[PDB]
């Protein structure tokens, strides 16, 4: 099966309150496994999955140094963006980075990522070719020229093709017990009364891993979604996920509606009725 290593890094300026917030979290697939948090008691790169607790001090020390390096350059980047956009020094702004790698069953690289956002909007992204950049506006075009001239894509490509993939394999061995699992959804339809003409049918999917899932309602074979309510997939807190989808259906014709569930752990999809 395919797998992903991803880091999500957030810096937030807080003028008049002190130095920016800086937090980095790392995920293997849908499982978080590390963090660095500037606002912690003793900010340090540290495990957030039990199968990471056996890595030695050299791992945490080197990773801590790398996070602290980024903390410094995110501070600089926040100031530079403020200058690029000619913004007040008084307001709070956000700078985000996501990077990492997707690998296929053969565990070679399917896609490498290095992309950035300013105040929650695309700023600059390394393209799938790991050679060129997509700039989101003319400020980011300035960055693009600087990073092209500096040869940044080659630097990142070397990480993405080598280190990123090789450490992803190590993580997948360290967590072989829990990371390679597939928990199929336990699904059911629940009835609740609504109107006097209509009724709510809620299709539940529970306890599944990975998070990717498809829930759809259909009425006698075709499809329903333009008023079907569909909540975001949510963590249970125990490493599994939950989701539901509901339709309003007039009374007596509940039998007419089916919920369909698609998930990796389901050889064939589920068709469910109340």
């Amino acid at each position: 099966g395919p797998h992903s290593l991803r880091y999500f890094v957030t810096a937030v300026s807080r003028p008049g309150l002190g130095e920016p917030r800086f937090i980095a979290v790392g995920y293997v697939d849908d499982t978080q496994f590390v963090r660095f948090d500037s606002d912690a008691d003793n900010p340090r790169f540290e495990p957030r999955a039990p199968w990471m607790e056996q890595e030695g001090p050299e791992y945490w020390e080197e990773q801590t140094q790398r996070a602290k390096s980024d903390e410094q350059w995110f501070r600089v980047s926040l100031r530079t963006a403020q200058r690029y956009y000619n913004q007040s020094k008084g307001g709070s702004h956000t700078f985000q980075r996501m990077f990492g790698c997707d690998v296929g069953s053969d565990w070679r690289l399917l896609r490498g990522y290095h992309q950035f956002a300013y105040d929650g909007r695309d700023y600059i992204a390394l393209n799938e070719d790991l050679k060129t950049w997509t700039a989101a506006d003319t400020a980011a075009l300035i960055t693009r020229r600087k990073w092209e001239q500096a040869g940044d894509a080659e630097y990142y490509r070397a990480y993405l093709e080598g280190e990123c993939v090789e450490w992803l394999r190590r993580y997948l061995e360290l967590g072989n017990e829990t990371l390679l699992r597939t928990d199929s959804p336990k699904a059911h339809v629940t009835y609740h009364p609504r109107s006097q003409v209509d009724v709510t049918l809620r299709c539940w999917a529970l306890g599944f891993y990975p998070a990717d899932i498809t829930l759809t309602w259909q009425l006698n074979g075709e499809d329903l979604t333009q008023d079907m309510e569909l909540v975001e997939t949510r963590p249970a807190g125990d490493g599994t996920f939950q989701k539901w989808a509901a339709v309003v259906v007039p009374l007596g014709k509940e039998q007419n509606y089916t919920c369909h569930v698609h998930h990796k752990g389901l050889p064939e999809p589920l068709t469910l009725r109340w």
């Binding site: 880091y7 980095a24 790392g26 590390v34 660095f36 790169f45 990773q63 790398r66 996070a67 390096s69 980024d70 350059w73 600089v76 980047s77 530079t80 963006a81 690029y84 980075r97 990077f99 950035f116 700023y123 600059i124 980011a140 960055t143 600087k146 500096a150 940044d152 630097y155 990480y159 280190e163 990123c164 450490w167």
Partner: peptide, 9 residues
């Protein structure tokens, strides 16, 4: 494995 950016935007 975390990897750094080398400089500013």
């Amino acid at each position: 494995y975390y990897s750094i950016i080398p400089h500013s935007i």
